[PDB]
CSV table of C-alpha atoms and ligand atoms in Angstrom, one decimal:
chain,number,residue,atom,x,y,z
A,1,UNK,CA,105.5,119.4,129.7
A,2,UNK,CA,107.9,117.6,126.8
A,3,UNK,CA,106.5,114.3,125.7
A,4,UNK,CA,109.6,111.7,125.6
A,5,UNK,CA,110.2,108.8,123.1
A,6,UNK,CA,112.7,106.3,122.8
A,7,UNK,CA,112.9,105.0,119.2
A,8,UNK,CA,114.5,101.8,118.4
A,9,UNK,CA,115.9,101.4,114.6
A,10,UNK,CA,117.2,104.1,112.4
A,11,UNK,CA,115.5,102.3,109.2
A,12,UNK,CA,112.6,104.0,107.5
A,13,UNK,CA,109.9,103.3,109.8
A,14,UNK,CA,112.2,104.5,112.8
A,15,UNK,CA,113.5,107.6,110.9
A,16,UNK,CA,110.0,108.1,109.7
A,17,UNK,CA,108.7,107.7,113.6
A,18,UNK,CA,111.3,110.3,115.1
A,19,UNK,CA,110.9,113.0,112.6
A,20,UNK,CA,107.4,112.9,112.7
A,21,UNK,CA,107.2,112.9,116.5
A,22,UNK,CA,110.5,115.9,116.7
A,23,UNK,CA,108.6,118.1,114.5
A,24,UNK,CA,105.2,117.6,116.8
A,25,UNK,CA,107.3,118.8,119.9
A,26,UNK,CA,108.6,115.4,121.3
A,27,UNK,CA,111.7,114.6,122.7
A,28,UNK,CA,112.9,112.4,120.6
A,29,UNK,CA,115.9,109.9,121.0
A,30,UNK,CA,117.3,107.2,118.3
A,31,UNK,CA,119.0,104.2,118.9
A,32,UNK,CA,120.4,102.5,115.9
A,33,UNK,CA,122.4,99.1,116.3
A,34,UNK,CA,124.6,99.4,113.4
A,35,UNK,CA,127.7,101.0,113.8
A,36,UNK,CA,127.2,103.6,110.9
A,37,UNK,CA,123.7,104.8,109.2
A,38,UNK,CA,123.0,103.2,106.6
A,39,UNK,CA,120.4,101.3,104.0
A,40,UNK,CA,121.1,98.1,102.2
A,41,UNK,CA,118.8,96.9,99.7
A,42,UNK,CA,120.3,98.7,96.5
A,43,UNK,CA,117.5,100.6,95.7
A,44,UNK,CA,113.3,101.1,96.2
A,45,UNK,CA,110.0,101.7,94.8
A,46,UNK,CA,107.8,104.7,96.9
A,47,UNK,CA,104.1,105.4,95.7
A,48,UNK,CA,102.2,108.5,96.2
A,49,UNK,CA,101.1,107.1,99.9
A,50,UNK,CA,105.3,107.8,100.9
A,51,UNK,CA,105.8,110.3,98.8
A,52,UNK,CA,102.8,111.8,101.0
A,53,UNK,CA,104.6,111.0,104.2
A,54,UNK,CA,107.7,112.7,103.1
A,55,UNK,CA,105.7,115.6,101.6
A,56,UNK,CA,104.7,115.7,105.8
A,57,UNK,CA,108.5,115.2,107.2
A,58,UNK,CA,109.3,117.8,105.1
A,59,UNK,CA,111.9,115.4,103.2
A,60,UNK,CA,109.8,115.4,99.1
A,61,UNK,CA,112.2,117.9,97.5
A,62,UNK,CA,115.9,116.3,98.6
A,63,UNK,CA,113.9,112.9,97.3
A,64,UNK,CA,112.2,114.1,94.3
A,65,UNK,CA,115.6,115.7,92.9
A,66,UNK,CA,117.8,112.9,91.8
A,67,UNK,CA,115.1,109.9,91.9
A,68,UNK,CA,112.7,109.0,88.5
A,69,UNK,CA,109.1,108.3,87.7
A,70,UNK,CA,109.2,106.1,84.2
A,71,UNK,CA,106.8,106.8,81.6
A,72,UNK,CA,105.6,103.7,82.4
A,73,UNK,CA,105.7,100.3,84.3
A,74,UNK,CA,106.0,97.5,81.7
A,75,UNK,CA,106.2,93.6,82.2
A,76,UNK,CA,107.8,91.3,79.6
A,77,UNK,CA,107.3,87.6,79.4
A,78,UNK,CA,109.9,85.8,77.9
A,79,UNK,CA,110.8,88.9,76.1
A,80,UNK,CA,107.6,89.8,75.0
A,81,UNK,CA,105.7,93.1,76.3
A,82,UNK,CA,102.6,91.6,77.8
A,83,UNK,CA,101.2,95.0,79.7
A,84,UNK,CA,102.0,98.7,80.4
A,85,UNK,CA,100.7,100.4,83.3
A,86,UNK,CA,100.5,104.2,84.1
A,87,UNK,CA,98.4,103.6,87.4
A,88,UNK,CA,96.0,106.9,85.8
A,89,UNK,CA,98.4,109.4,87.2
A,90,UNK,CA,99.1,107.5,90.7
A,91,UNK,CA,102.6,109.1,91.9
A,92,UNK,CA,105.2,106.9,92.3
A,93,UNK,CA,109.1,106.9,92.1
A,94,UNK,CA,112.3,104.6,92.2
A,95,UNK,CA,115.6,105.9,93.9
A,96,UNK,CA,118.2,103.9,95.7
A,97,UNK,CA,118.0,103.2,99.2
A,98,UNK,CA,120.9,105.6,100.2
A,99,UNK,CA,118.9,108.4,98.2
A,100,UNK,CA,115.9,108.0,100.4
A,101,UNK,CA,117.8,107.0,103.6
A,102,UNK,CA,120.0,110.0,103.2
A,103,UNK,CA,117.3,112.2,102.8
A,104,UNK,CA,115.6,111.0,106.3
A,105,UNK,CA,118.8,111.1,107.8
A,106,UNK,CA,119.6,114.6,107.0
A,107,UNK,CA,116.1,115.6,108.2
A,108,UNK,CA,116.3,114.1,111.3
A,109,UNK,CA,119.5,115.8,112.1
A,110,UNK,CA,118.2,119.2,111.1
A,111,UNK,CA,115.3,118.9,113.8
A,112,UNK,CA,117.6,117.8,116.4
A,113,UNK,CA,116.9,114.4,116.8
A,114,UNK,CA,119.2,112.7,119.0
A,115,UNK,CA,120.7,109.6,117.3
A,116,UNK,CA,122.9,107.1,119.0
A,117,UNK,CA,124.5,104.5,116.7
A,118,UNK,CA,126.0,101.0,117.9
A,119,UNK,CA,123.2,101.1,120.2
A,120,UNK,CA,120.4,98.4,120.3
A,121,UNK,CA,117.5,97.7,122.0
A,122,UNK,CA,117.4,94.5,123.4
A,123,UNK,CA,114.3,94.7,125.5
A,124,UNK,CA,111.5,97.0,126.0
A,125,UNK,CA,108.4,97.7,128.8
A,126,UNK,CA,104.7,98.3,128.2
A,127,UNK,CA,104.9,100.7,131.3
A,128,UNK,CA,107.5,103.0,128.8
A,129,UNK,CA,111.1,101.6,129.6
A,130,UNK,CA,113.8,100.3,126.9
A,131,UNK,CA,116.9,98.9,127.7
A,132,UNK,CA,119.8,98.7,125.4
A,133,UNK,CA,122.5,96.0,125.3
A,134,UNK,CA,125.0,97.8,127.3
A,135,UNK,CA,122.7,97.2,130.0
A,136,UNK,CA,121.3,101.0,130.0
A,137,UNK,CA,117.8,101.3,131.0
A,138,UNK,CA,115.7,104.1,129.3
A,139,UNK,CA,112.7,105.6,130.3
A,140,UNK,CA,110.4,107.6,128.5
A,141,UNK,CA,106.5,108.4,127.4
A,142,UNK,CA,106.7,106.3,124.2
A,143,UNK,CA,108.9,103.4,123.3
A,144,UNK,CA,108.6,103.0,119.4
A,145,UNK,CA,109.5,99.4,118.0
A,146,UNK,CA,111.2,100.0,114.6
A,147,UNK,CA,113.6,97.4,115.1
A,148,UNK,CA,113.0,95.6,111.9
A,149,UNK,CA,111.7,91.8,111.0
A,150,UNK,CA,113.9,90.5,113.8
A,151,UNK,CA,112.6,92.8,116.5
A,152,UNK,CA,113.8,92.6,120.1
A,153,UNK,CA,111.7,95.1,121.2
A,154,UNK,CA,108.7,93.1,120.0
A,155,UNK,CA,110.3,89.5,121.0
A,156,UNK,CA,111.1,90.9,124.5
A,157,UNK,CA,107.2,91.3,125.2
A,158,UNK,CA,106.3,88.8,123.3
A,159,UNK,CA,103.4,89.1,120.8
A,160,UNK,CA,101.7,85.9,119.1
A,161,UNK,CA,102.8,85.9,115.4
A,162,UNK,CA,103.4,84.1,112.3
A,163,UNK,CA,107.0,84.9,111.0
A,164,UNK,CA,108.1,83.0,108.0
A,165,UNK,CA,110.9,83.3,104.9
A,166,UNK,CA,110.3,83.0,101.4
A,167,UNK,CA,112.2,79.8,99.9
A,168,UNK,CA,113.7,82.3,96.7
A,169,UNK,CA,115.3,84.9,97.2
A,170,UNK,CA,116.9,87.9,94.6
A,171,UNK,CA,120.5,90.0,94.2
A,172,UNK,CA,119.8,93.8,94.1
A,173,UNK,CA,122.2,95.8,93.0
A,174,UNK,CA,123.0,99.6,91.6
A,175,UNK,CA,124.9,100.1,87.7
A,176,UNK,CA,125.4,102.6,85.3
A,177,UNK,CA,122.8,103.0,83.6
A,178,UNK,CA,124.7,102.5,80.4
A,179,UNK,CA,121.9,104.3,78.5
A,180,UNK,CA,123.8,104.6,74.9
A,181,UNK,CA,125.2,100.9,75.2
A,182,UNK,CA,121.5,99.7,75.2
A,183,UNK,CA,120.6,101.2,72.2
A,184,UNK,CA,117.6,101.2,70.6
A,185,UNK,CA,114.2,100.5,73.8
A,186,UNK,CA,112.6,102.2,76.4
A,187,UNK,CA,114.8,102.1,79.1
A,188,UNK,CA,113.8,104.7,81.0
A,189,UNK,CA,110.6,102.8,81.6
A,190,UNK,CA,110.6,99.7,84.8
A,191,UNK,CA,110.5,96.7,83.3
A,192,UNK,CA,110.0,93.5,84.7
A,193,UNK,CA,111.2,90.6,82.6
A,194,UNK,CA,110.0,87.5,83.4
A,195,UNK,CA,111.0,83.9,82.2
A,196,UNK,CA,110.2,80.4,83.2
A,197,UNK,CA,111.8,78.9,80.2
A,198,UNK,CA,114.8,77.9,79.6
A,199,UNK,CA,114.9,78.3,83.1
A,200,UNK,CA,113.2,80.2,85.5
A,201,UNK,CA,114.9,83.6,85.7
A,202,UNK,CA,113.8,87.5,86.2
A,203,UNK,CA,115.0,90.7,86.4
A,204,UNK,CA,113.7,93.5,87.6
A,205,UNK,CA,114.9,96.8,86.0
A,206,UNK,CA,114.2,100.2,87.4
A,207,UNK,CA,115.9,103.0,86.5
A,208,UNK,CA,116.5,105.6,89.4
A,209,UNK,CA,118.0,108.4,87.9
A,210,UNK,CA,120.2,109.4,84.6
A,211,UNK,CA,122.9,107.8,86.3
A,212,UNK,CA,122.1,104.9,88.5
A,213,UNK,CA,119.6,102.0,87.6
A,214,UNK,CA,118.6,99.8,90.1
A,215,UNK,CA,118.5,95.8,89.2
A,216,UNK,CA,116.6,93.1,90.8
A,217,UNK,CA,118.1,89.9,89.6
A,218,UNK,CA,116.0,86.8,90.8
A,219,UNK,CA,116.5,83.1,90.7
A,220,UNK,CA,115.8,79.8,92.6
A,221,UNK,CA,118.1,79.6,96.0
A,222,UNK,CA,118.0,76.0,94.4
A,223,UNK,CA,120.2,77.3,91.3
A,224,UNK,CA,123.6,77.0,91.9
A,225,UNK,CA,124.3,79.8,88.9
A,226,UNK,CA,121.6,81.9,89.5
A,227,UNK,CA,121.9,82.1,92.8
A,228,UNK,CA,125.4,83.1,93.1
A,229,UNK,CA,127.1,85.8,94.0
A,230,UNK,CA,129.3,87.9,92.9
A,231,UNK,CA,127.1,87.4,90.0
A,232,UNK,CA,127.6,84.6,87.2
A,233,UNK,CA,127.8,87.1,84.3
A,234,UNK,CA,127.3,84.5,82.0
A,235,UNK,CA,123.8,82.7,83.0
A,236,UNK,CA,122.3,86.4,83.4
A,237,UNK,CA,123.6,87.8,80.1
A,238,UNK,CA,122.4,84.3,78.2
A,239,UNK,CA,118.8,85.3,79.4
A,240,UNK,CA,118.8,88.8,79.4
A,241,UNK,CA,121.7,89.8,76.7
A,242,UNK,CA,119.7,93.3,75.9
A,243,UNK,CA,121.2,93.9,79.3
A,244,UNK,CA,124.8,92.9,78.8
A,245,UNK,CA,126.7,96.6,79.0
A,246,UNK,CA,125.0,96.9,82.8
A,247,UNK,CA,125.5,93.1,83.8
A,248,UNK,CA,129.0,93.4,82.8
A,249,UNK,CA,128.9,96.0,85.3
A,250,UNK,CA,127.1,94.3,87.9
A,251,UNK,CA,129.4,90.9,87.6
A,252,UNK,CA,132.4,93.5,89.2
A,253,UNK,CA,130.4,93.9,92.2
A,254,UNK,CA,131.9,92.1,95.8
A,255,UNK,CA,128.6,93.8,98.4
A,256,UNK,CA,125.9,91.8,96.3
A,257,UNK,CA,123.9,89.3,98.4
A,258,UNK,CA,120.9,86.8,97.8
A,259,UNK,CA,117.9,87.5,99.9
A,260,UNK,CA,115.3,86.1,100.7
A,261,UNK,CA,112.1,88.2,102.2
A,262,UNK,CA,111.1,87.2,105.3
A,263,UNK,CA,107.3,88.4,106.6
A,264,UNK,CA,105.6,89.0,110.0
A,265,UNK,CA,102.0,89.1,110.7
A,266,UNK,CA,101.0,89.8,114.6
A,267,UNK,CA,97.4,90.3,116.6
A,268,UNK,CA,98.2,93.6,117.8
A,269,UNK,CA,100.7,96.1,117.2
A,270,UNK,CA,100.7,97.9,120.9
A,271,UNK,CA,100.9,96.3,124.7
A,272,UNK,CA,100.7,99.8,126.9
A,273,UNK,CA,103.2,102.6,125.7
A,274,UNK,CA,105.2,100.4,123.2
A,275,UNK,CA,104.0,100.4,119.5
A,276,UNK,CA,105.8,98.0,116.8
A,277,UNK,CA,106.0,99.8,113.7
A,278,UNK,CA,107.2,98.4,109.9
A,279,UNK,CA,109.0,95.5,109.8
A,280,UNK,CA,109.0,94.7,113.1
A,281,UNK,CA,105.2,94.4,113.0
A,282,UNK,CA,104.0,93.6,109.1
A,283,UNK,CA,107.2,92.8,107.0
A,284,UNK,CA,105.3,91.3,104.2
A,285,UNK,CA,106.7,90.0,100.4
A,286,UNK,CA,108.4,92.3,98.2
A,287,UNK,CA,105.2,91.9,95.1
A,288,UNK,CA,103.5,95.0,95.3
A,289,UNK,CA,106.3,97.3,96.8
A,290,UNK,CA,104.4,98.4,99.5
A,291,UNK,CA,107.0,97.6,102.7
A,292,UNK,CA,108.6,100.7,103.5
A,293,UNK,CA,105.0,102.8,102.0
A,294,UNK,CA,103.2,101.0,104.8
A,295,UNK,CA,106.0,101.0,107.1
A,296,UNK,CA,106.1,105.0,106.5
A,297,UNK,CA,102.7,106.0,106.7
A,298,UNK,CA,102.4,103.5,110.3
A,299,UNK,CA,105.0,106.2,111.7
A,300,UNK,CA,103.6,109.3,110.3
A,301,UNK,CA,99.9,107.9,111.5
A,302,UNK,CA,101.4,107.2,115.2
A,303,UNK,CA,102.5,110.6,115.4
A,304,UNK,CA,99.0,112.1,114.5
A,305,UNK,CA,97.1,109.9,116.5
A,306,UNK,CA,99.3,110.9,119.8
A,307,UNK,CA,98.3,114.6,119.3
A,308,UNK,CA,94.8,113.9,120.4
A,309,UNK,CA,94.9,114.6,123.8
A,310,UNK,CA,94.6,111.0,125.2
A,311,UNK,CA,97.1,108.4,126.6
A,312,UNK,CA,99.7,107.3,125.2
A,313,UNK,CA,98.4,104.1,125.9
A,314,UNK,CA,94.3,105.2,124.0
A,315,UNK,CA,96.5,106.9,121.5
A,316,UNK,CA,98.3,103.5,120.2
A,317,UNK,CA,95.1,101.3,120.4
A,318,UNK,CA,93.4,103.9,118.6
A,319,UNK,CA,96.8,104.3,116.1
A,320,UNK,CA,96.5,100.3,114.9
A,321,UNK,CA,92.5,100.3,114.4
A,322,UNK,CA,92.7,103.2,112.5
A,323,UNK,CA,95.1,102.6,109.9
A,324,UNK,CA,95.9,98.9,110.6
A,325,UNK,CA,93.4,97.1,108.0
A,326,UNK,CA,95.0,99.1,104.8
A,327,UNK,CA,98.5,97.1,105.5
A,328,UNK,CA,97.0,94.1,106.5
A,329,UNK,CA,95.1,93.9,103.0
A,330,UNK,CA,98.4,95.5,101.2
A,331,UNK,CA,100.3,92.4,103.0
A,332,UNK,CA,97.7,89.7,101.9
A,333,UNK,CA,97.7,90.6,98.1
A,334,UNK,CA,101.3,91.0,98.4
A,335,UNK,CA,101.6,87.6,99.8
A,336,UNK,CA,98.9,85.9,97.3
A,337,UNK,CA,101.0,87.9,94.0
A,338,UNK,CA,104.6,86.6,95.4
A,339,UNK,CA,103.4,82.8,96.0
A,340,UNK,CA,101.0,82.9,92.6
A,341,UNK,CA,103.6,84.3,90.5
A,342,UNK,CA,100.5,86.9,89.8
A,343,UNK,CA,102.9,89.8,88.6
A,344,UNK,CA,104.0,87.5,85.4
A,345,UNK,CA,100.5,88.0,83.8
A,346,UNK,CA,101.1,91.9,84.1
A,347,UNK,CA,97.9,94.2,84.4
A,348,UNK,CA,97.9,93.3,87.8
A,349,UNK,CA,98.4,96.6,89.5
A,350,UNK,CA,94.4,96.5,89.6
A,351,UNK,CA,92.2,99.2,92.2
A,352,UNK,CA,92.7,96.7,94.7
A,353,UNK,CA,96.6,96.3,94.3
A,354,UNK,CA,97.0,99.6,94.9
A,355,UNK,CA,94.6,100.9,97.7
A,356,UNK,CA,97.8,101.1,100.3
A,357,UNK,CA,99.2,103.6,97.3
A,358,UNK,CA,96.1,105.6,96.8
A,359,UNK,CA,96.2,106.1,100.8
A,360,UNK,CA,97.2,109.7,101.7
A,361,UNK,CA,98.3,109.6,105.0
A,362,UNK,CA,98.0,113.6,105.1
A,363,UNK,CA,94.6,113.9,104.4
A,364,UNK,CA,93.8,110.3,105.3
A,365,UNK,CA,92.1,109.7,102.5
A,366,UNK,CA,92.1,107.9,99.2
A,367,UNK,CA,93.3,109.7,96.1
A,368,UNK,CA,94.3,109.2,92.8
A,369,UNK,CA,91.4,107.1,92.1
A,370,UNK,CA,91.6,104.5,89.2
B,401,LIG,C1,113.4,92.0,98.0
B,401,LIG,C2,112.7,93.2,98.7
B,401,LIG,C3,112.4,94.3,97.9
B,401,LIG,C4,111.7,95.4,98.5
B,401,LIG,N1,111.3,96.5,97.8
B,401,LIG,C5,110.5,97.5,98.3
B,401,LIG,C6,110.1,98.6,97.6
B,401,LIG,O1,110.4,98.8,96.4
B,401,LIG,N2,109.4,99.5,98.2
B,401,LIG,C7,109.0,99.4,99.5
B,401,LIG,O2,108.4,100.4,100.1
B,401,LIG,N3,109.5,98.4,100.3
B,401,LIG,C8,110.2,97.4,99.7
B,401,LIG,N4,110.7,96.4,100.5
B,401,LIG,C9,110.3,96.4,102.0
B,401,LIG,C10,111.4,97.3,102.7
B,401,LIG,O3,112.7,96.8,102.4
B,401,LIG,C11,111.1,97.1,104.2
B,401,LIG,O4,109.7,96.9,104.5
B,401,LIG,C12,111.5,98.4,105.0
B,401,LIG,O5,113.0,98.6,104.8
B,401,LIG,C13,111.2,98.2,106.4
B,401,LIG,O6,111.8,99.3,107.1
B,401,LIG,P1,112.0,99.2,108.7
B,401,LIG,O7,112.5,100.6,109.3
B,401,LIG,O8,110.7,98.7,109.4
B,401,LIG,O9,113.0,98.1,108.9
B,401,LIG,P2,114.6,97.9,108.5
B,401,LIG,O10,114.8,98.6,107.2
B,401,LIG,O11,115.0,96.5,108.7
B,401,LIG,O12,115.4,98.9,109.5
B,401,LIG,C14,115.5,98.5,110.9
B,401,LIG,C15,116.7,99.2,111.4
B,401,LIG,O13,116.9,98.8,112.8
B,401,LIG,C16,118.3,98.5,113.0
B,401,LIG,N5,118.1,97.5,114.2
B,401,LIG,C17,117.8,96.2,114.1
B,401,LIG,N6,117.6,95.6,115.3
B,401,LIG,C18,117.8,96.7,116.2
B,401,LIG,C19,117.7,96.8,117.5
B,401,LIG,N7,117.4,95.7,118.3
B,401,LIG,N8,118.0,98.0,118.1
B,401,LIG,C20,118.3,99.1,117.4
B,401,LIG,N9,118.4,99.0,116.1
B,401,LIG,C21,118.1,97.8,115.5
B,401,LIG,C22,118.7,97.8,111.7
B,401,LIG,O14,120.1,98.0,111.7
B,401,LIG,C23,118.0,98.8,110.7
B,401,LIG,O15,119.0,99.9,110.5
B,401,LIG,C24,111.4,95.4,99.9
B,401,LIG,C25,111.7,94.3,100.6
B,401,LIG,C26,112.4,93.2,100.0
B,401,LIG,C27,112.8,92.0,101.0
């Protein structure tokens, strides 16, 4: 009769997963590690390939209200406009990471997912068995691995990989928006100012609603000024002083971190009823803002491949050929853009940049052509 999964991570991909599967009939059951639900990050780009996913968890409205699509996405170098990109009518969106992780949560809960926090997987079995690290051993029809870049669910089996971390790193943050203190621009538009010189310096800027904006502030780990945090107000506002009212307002911040993004690349994605799904399987560089898009549409394309009628086991193979090559292309460009510094020349959200984007899991095909 009921179909049962045991879904480890309450991220994105794990919310995504459990949702997806809920509203298909499974009995679904989440197990987050974290004391409290929760998303850190600050905030986050979605494309119309998300978007489509949430349009299918039936979580697009609670998104679309408070989040923002700028007229358009512009790059500066050194303070000149090099490039402004509309994408020819490709959805997109920025929110903060709450905004979106809310939203999932809040979904979950109204289909009855059953959500377990301070509760981690520590190992899993390809014959449908995960076992948490109070020592409780789960069974169930489907063990989903959504344990993030440092999954045990996938180091427990073992799966050949390459795992790496980028040597920079970036402090994201949310501000006021501080919209009549910048005067006279486009802020409402992203903007992603670039310098090399005086020194090497950028800031992303994305605005995610009339009240919060959503800052990306990036600088060698090798800079002890850049690199600090709480933030040094002074190094930031000598490079970006157009920005002044909202780095004031990021200096008084005491939850700002450096990051730096870590990837993982892995021959398969499934070993019997366990599939590995966003970071835990293909955490790839931040460049085309694409993680938690192809992350998202993974977990909404398990789901559909598992109502076929086959096993569980047929179902997953069948899952990761299917819809596998799209993030493993997404995560190459991605990769390529981060260590070539291609985003500085702007224009570079060509056809190919954007094919995981254009993807509409729903339909499973590719819209919004360019
Ligand atoms: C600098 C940067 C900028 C980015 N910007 C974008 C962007 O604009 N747009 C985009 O789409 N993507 C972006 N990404 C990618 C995005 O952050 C990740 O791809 C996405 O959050 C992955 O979601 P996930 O659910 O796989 O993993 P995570 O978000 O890591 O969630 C995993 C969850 O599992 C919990 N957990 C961990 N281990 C266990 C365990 N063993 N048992 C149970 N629970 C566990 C963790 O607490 C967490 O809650 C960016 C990434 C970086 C580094």
């Amino acid at each position: 009769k009921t179909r049962r999964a045991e879904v480890a991570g309450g991220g994105f991909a794990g919310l995504t997963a459990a949702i997806a599967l809920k509203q298909n009939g499974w009995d679904v059951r989440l197990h987050e590690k974290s004391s409290e639900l929760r998303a850190f990050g600050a905030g986050i780009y979605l494309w119309h390939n998300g978007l489509r996913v949430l349009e299918g968890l039936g979580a697009l409205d609670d998104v679309l209200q408070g989040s923002h699509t700028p007229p358009t996405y512009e790059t500066w170098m050194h303070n000149k406009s090099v490039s402004k990109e509309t994408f020819n009518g490709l959805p997109w969106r920025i929110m903060t990471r709450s905004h979106l992780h809310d939203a999932l949560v809040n979904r979950a809960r109204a289909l009855g997912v059953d959500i377990s926090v301070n509760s981690e997987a520590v190992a899993a079995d390809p014959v449908g068995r995960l076992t948490l690290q109070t020592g409780e051993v789960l069974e169930a029809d489907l063990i989903v691995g959504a344990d993030g870049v440092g999954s045990k669910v996938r180091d427990s089996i073992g799966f050949k990989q390459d795992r790496w971390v980028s040597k920079d790193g970036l402090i994201r943050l949310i501000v006021p928006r501080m919209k009549k203190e910048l005067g006279h621009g486009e802020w409402d538009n992203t903007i992603d100012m670039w310098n090399f010189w005086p020194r090497v310096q950028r800031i992303l800027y994305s605005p995610c609603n009339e009240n919060e904006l959503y800052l990306g502030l990036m600088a060698p780990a090798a800079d002890p000024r850049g690199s600090s945090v709480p933030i040094d107000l002074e190094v930031w506002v000598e490079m970006f002083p157009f920005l002044e009212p909202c780095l004031i307002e990021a200096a008084k911040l005491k939850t700002a971190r450096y990051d730096k993004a870590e990837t993982t690349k892995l021959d398969s994605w499934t070993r019997g009823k366990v599939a590995l799904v966003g970071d835990a399987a293909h955490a790839m560089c931040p460049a085309l803002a694409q993680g938690a898009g192809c992350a998202m549409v993974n977990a909404f394309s398990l789901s559909q491949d598992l109502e076929e009628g086959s096993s569980v086991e047929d179902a997953l193979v069948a899952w990761e050929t299917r819809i596998r090559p799209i993030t493993d292309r997404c995560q190459a460009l991605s990769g390529d853009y981060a260590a070539n510094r291609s985003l500085s020349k702007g224009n570079m959200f060509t056809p190919a940049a954007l094919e995981a984007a254009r993807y509409d899991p729903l339909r499973r095909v590719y819209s919004w052509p360019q």
